[PDB]
RNA sequence: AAACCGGGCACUACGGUGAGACGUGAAAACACCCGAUCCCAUUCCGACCUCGAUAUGUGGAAUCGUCUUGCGCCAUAUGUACUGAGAUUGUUCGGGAGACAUGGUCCAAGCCCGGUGA
């Protein structure tokens, strides 16, 4: 029913079975979480940081001890906010690095200055440093990693 | 001894639309986000009216979808990227293969007899070259076959040699029409479309395409 | 600088209330026994004002009236994904709810077993075909394939590309890119 | 850490031979009553058997562990024993499946040491 | 989830830059849903370099 | 019916606990693969647990097997240290490590439920 998953089973799937050496269907790589963690100095106090959080997540976060910020996105909360990024993703050129399992990406205010949803209500977002977005994928090597975000990050432009 | 092994290409287009989902399943979608909205925190009509001080008449121009059903769909017009939006495409060529059980034409993938290649892939992206002109609006998965099937002499038929045929598989980039020459005709059908025109190979390709 | 009426603002959405207030059962008797003693908490107290000038109806929650998938005038029947006679009817209960999630398992299950037979058979297929080759020709084809996909090649999604769109946003980008733009 | 053995529960001044102990899988319940001294199965009930298989439909969850709770406390009864003593696993609580069975056995009329 | 701890969500439209539809979640900011349409807004930059800039001006 | 296989309990370091390689899902069993509506789980999240669903897909994670092995554990030296009694200023009679060295990872095995045999 979904773009992104549906996407994913019917195209990636089989092609990723057919470009390299797998003994099973089930070790096939997928798509475990989204880890957001926001940038290092920040204020802790104040209702922007919270709400800045709040609004492109989701759901509430986390604030262990206050030092420490945190949210998890497994599944279809997952899902769309995957969507949503790599469809503003379009507009910009914004780099990724990837690891070993997982992909990282630097959400900047001059990510939501291109979403445009969040156009509007903007004061929330200005004076925030940005968050740190992690990927977190099931693949045993890095090129497995950038083969699946290869195959997830589409456009019709070029 | 054993030689003369053919390679063919399945030349395919995607999906453009997503086909139509479970009633169930979008029943229960729906059920699902209705119920799960009286839980959850409701924002107040001050923080949504700096959206609503936001609103504005601009140059109105307002967005009508395309349909999903196409005129090349009502029309039942083959050689067509247009239609069949929700399944799959798949060409087929129209002329003389490499089994010699007639001259007559009939329909066949694109393919090629190996002699000096490293690999097969290079035998079979010169063998669309040799179809469709030119390999810039094309992208070959793999470099291993996705199937094979070897022909063997049966009692009514001992002329032909033995020989294997080997598929491998490309897709189609971002192109809408193509020039295909070095055959007689073409077509773009689907999976149920592809077999009724194979009654005989019907068992193979039936494992070998997913639907 | 940042205004002290902003950030009251935006506390009280920080502190959003709901159109249902649910309670665990550890924690309505303990405001069972509250209402015995008759202390009343805030949240209570909000609930009550909320009750007192309406309820979950005025924060636009409806059983009989489901809202549907998507935005005003494009939801799934008009797109034409579905017909008007295909769409099973329900209500936002719980009685509706179980029978609906029932029958979501079954056909999601069914669906996955069939998609994760057909890609065994497939794979089956690709390892018997890599067998019946010769020596160096094997070699060869037994390389992983590190290509990345292409990035034009679609995605799928809820409708086909208009004809005149892309090329017409292309040709405005260009006509703004064309010239300098002035220091 | 490593997770030590365990042990059965303390002698303090009186034997209390009779051990419930219960089992769910994906398909089936099972529960056992272990006399401790010969270490032998004194009852058991499962939706496993030949008598029970076919006359319930479901036979994986709440509903069913309940009817084997009921079956089981009334086979002890005819068995005579008045009471059994019950011993939960490293991952059981008293919830769903462990409590049907526990309140049907409760229910049945054997009394829980 | 738990009840009572997360924000309101909302469905808008997305159009692609070749006129597709898509449907998302969102959290729940606005009134009603609304369609937003994507465009080339690539926003390249290039700098001159400094022969180009001598051919510019001295022929 | 008497054997074999699967699950639960029971026995146990020669029966423990890790690592590697090769296999196995019997018409049955176990687990995974799917979902989060009610119960439950999360100081955010179906990650863990829980609750539902699976005419047949997979043994990728776990679970079963076979061997190689590392720590352990068991058995046994030879010799020395040390030591009880006794003064030829300990010339006698007893006990006996640690660390080395050598081998093994046995044998036997009960109850219930299900399947194949029948
Ligand atoms: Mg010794």
């Not at chain 2, 196409?70 to 293969?97: H, V």
């Given at each position: ?29 997928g ?41 998890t996105l ?13 469809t ?13 399992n ?7 205010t ?19 440093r940005?968050?740190?977005?992690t ?16 195959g ?7 | ?78 050689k ?6 929700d ?14 059980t ?82 007689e ?8 479309e ?11 390709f039936?494992?070998?395409?997913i639907? | 600088?940042?205004?002290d ?8 959405c ?29 949240d ?28 005003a ?111 | ?10 002698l ?5 031979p009779?051990?419930?102990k ?19 199965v ?6 496993q058997?030949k008598?029970?298989?076919?006359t ?13 709770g ?17 011993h939960?696993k ?14 049907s ?9 | ?59």
């Amino acid at each position: 029913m979904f773009p992104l998953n549906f996407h994913y089973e019917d195209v990636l799937r089989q092609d990723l079975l057919l470009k390299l050496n797998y003994a099973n269907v089930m070790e096939v790589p997928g798509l475990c979480e989204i880890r957001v963690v926001p940038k290092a100095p920040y204020n802790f106090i104040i209702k922007n940081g919270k709400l800045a959080m709040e609004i492109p997540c989701g759901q509430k976060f986390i604030q262990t001890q206050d030092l420490a910020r945190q949210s998890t996105l497994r599944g279809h909360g997952m899902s769309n906010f995957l969507v949503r990024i790599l469809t503003v993703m379009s507009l910009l050129d914004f780099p990724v690095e990837i690891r070993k399992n997982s992909i990282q990406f630097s959400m900047e205010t001059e990510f939501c200055e291109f979403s445009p949803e969040l156009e509007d209500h903007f004061e929330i977002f200005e004076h925030i440093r940005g968050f740190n977005v992690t990927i977190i994928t099931s693949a045993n090597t890095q090129d497995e990693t950038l083969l699946l975000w290869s195959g997830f990050l589409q456009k019709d432009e070029g | 001894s054993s030689d003369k092994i053919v390679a063919s290409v399945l030349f395919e287009r995607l999906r453009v639309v997503i086909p139509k989902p479970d009633p169930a399943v979008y029943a229960f979608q729906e059920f699902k986000f209705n119920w799960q909205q009286q839980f959850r925190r409701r924002y107040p009509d001050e923080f949504l009216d700096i959206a609503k001080n936001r609103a504005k008449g601009e140059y109105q121009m307002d967005y009508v979808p395309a349909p999903r059903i196409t005129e090349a769909d009502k029309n039942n017009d083959r050689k067509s990227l247009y239609r069949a939006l929700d399944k799959k495409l798949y060409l087929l060529i129209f002329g003389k293969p490499f089994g010699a059980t007639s001259d007559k034409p009939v329909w066949h993938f694109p393919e090629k007899v190996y002699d000096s290649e490293p690999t097969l892939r290079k035998c079979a992206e010169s063998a669309l070259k040799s179809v469709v002109g030119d390999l810039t609006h094309t992208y070959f998965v793999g470099n291993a076959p996705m199937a094979h099937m070897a022909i063997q002499p049966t009692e009514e038929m001992p002329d032909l040699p033995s020989y294997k045929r080997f598929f491998f598989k490309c897709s189609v980039v971002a192109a809408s029409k193509y020039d295909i020459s070095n055959c007689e005709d073409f077509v773009w059908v689907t999976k149920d479309e592809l077999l009724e025109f194979f009654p005989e190979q019907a068992e193979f390709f039936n494992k070998m395409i997913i639907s | 600088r940042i205004s002290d009426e902003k950030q009251k603002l935006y506390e009280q959405c920080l502190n959003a209330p709901c159109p249902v207030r649910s309670l665990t059962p550890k924690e309505a008797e303990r405001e069972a026994q509250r209402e015995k003693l008759g202390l009343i908490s805030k949240d209570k107290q909000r609930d009550m004002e909320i009750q007192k000038k309406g309820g979950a109806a005025a924060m636009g929650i409806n059983t009989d009236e489901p809202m549907r998938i998507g935005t005003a005038g494009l939801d799934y029947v008009s797109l034409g994904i579905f017909s008007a006679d295909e769409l099973v009817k329900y209500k936002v209960t719980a009685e509706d709810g179980e029978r609906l999630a029932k029958e979501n398992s079954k056909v999601l299950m069914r669906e996955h077993r069939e998609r994760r037979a057909a890609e065994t058979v497939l794979l089956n297929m690709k390892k018997a075909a890599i067998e019946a080759l010769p020596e160096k020709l094997k070699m060869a084809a037994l390389e992983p394939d590190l290509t990345p996909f292409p990035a034009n090649r679609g995605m799928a999604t809820l409708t086909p590309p208009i004809e005149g769109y892309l090329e017409k946003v292309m040709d405005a980008a260009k006509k703004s890119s064309s010239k300098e733009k002035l220091r | 850490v490593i997770p030590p053995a365990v042990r059965p529960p303390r002698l303090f001044d009186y034997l209390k031979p009779y051990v419930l102990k219960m089992h769910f899988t994906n398909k089936f319940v099972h529960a056992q009553v272990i006399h401790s001294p010969t270490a032998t199965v004194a009852c058991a009930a499962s939706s496993q058997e030949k008598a029970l298989r076919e006359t319930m439909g479901v036979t994986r969850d709440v509903a069913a562990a309940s009817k084997i709770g009921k079956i089981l406390g009334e086979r002890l009864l005819m068995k005579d024993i008045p009471a059994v003593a019950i011993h939960m696993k490293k991952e059981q609580r008293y919830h769903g499946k462990v409590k049907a069975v526990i309140d049907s056995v409760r229910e049945a009329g054997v009394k829980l040491l | 989830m738990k009840k009572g701890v997360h924000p309101q969500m909302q469905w808008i439209s997305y159009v692609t830059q070749s006129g597709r539809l898509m449907h998302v979640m969102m959290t729940r900011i606005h009134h009603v849903g609304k369609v937003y349409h994507f465009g080339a807004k690539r926003q390249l930059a290039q700098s001159i370099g400094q022969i180009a800039k001598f051919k510019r001006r001295f022929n």
